[PDB]
């Protein structure tokens, strides 16, 4: 408990995540208190949605803390994949908010509308603070990208509600709210597509996209090593951001210099950017 | 488009998933049509939630179809991880519904309540059909488990709303609805915990839990092989259900019989259940 805090404040990403989480939780707490005091329902609903949103910041901060943990027997690669998972969760978060935003708008279209504005401007201010803090976001790449996208989705929602309120005050358009809600939901989904693509590619054990184009040249150089007969069972995957794991099997001549072949194969794949490589060498019969 | 359908109907899991998805989509469509016809709002909201829920069945069916695709250059392990992802998404789905259920209940507690019942019984019937179809569910293990948990969450929600409606009709308890909603949300989370644990362990490249206990004995037998000096950089992870990948590096004597050591190491880890194994052999200087 106590020891976790000094670890959080040690890192810049973790410190910023913790401060933003505290800000969001305090805002949601004040919203809940004002809603119960001023017997409001939209206030309570917004506070619950804010707690749900802050759960994603919790996930990002937890991933940032856990990623630095040392590897053990159960987690032989360490806990770096947490970073990827955080991003994948954040994106899913966004997809499960945008749709509901969509839903709400449609309901507000099929229903007589019958404050909730000054609170939205304060949320917009907090989102601007988050954008300023995490501007460089969009292993910590996926955590920062997901958190930045989450704050962007919140900012888009605040802009949408503010625009709807102004447009139906000054000019009295009752159709502005559904269109704005649908548009912001579509924008949220579009913004989240690339992060989800990257996270899903990592989680499906896909070949690292930055390494895929250089792999055939690496295979060709390995085949040109003296005493190599063939390559098989090649697998390259992403452990976390810029950390690539490779496994391959070589068939070599029955008298081949395996020490030299091993060192050459490691050199070839180290120049290609593979951090961790396993080369099995099988001596052929003939 | 057309060719996908014959692939879906070929498999039992895919066929059941497709039929359940069609049933859910038809139910949601009829609910939307009746809501727009009978100018209802709860009907429209329930139809939107049903479409959102059917999105999870879509994810499961898509994972089941894609998992059988052959491996290519980009996806060297194939697409089996989709199964795991489906489960992980399903669980997240559940967590993002239960909480909102929780939220709704609290709102209905802090608000004067002011049909939506006969529809709930029909949804309960459909959920019973799903339970009957997918009883054995709880690579297809994680898909079936996640789909079963999703149908269980829907059944729990239907039971909760039905119980609240009966209890506030016959005996007039206005507090029954919040307690029932909170209880079903807690039950949903508890039910989803183990699937999420298994999926997260797979996605963090954790040591397979069924293989972890036998690994030290395997290491000990490898060290007892003649000419072996040490083991290092061992990694064992789960590709999909019951498919384990291992990588290790051996340091051996400078004159060691590498063919025999390689075959013995493969035998040792094949008896332990490792499907795919990479053994790098480095000859020591001295």
């Amino acid at each position: 408990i106590s020891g976790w805090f000094r670890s959080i404040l040690s890192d810049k990403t973790s410190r910023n995540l913790f401060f933003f989480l505290c800000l969001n939780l305090s805002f949601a707490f004040v919203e809940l208190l004002y809603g119960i005091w001023s017997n409001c329902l939209g206030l309570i609903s917004d506070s619950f949605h804010m707690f749900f949103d802050s759960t994603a910041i919790l996930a990002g901060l937890a991933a940032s803390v856990i990623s630095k943990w040392r590897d053990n027997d159960a987690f032989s690669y360490g806990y770096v994949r947490a970073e990827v998972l955080a991003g994948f969760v954040n994106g899913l978060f966004l997809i499960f908010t945008a749709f509901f935003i969509f839903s709400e708008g449609v309901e507000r279209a099929l229903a007589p509308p019958d404050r909730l504005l000054l609170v939205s401007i304060l949320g917009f201010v907090v989102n601007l603070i988050g954008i300023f803090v995490f501007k460089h976001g969009g292993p910590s790449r996926q955590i920062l990208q997901g958190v930045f996208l989450h704050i962007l989705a919140d900012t888009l929602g605040s802009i949408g509600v503010i625009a709807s309120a102004i447009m139906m005050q000054n000019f009295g358009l009752m159709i502005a709210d559904p269109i704005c809600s649908i548009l912001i939901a579509i924008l949220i989904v579009v913004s989240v597509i690339p992060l989800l693509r990257e996270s899903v590619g990592i989680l499906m054990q896909r070949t690292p996209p930055l390494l895929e184009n250089s792999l055939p040249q690496c295979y060709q150089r390995v085949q040109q090593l003296q005493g190599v007969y063939s390559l098989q069972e090649q697998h390259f995957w992403t452990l976390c951001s810029d950390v690539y794991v490779g496994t391959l099997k070589l068939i070599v001549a029955p008298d081949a210099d395996a020490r030299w072949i091993l060192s050459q194969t490691h050199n070839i794949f180290t120049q290609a950017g593979v951090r961790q490589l396993y080369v099995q060498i099988d001596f052929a019969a003939m | 488009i057309s060719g996908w359908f014959r692939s879906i109907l070929s498999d039992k899991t895919s066929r059941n998933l497709f039929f359940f998805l069609c049933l859910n989509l038809s139910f949601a469509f009829v609910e939307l049509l009746y809501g727009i016809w009978s100018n209802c709002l709860g009907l429209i909201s329930d139809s939107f939630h049903m479409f959102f829920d059917s999105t999870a069945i879509l994810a499961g069916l898509a994972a089941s179809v894609i998992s059988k695709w052959r491996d290519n250059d980009a996806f060297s392990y194939g697409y089996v991880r989709a199964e795991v992802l489906a489960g992980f998404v399903n669980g997240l789905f559940l967590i993002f519904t239960a909480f909102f259920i929780f939220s709704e209940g609290v709102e209905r507690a802090l608000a004067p309540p002011d049909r939506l019942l006969l529809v709930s019984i029909l949804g309960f019937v459909v959920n019973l059909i799903g339970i009957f179809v997918f009883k054995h569910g709880g690579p297809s293990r994680q898909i079936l488990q996640g789909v079963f948990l999703h149908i269980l969450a829907d059944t729990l929600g239907s039971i909760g709303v039905i119980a609240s409606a009966i209890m506030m009709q016959n005996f007039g308890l206005m507090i029954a609805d919040p307690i029932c909603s909170i209880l079903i949300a807690i039950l949903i989370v508890v039910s989803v915990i183990p699937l999420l644990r298994e999926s997260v362990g797979i996605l963090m490249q954790r040591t397979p839990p069924l293989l972890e206990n036998s690994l030290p004995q395997c290491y000990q037998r490898v060290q007892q092989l003649q000419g072996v000096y040490s083991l290092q950089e061992q990694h064992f992870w789960t590709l999909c259900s019951d498919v384990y990948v291992g990588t290790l590096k051996l340091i051996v004597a400078p004159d060691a019989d590498a063919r025999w050591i390689l075959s013995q190491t493969h035998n040792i880890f094949t008896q332990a259940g490792v499907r795919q194994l990479y053994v790098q052999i480095d000859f020591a200087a001295m």
Epitope: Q224, Q226, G227, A253, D255, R259, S263, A284 | -
Partner: antibody, heavy 118, light 112 residues
Framework: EVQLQESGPGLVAPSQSLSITCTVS????????VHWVRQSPGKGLEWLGV???????DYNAAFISRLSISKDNSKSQVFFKMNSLQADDTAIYYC????????????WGQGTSVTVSS | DIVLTQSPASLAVSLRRRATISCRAS??????????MHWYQQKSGQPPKLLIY???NLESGVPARFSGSGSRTDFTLTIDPVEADDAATYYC?????????FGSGTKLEIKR
């Protein structure tokens, strides 16, 4: 009693082809690579190529266009063929067995002296 | 290709003394803790004979008076004690990069 013996012409006309046969005893070409190396006073020892047990051949870059190495496992012979022989190719040519699992050569043939002149 | 320079070109050593031959590589011939350098001895009218493989390993059948050392780009072959039959030309060869290349050669003549 591992032995390699080279047989070939002692004189080759310029721009012609040189053919050498290396006969091996005491080991099989089904598990040993055989290197071809030439030695001349002007250039010293020069690695020409290697032929592996499955038939894979690895040549020197400077001779890739005019060199061909083949073999027959049944009669245990390795055939070395060079095209476009100029005067600088005058050298003693050796077939050597590859030292197992190493990049060295452990057994060498006696070598055949080949000179290129009219 | 990797260029090997052998210094000195000729070294004069009396009987029972120590002789040292050096081979210098333009680029490193090492890979993962192994130096892929080999030492050969060639007597007059005889094919080269392998003495050392991988820069420090004594080939089976050669006298224990031959020793090898070095790493990266600096390699040394040492004869102690120097005998009469050691008068020959000693070559260094690298197998780290294709093509295989040999050193210029150092000629050992005996002082008596």
């Amino acid at each position: 009693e591992v032995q390699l013996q080279e047989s070939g012409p002692g004189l080759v006309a310029p721009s012609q082809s040189l053919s050498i046969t290396c006969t091996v005893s005491g080991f099989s070409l089904t598990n040993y690579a055989v290197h071809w190396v030439r030695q001349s006073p002007g250039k010293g020892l020069e690695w020409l190529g290697v032929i592996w047990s499955n038939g894979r051949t690895d040549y020197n870059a400077a001779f890739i266009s005019r060199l061909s190495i083949s073999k027959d496992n049944s009669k245990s012979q390795v055939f070395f063929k060079m095209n476009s022989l100029q005067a600088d190719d005058t050298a003693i040519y050796y077939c050597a067995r590859k030292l197992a699992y190493e990049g060295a050569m452990d057994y060498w043939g006696q070598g055949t002296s080949v000179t290129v002149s009219s | 290709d990797i260029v090997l320079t052998q210094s000195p070109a000729s070294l004069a050593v009396s009987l029972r003394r120590r002789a040292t031959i050096s081979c210098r590589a333009s680029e490193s011939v090492d890979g993962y803790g192994h130096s892929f350098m080999h030492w050969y001895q060639q007597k007059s009218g005889q094919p080269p004979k392998l003495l050392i493989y991988r820069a420090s390993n004594l080939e089976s059948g050669v006298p224990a008076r031959f020793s090898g050392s070095g790493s990266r780009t600096d390699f040394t072959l040492t004869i102690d004690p120097v005998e009469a039959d050691d008068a020959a030309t000693y070559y260094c060869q690298q197998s780290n990069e294709d093509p295989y290349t040999f050193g210029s050669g150092t000629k050992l003549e005996i002082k008596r």
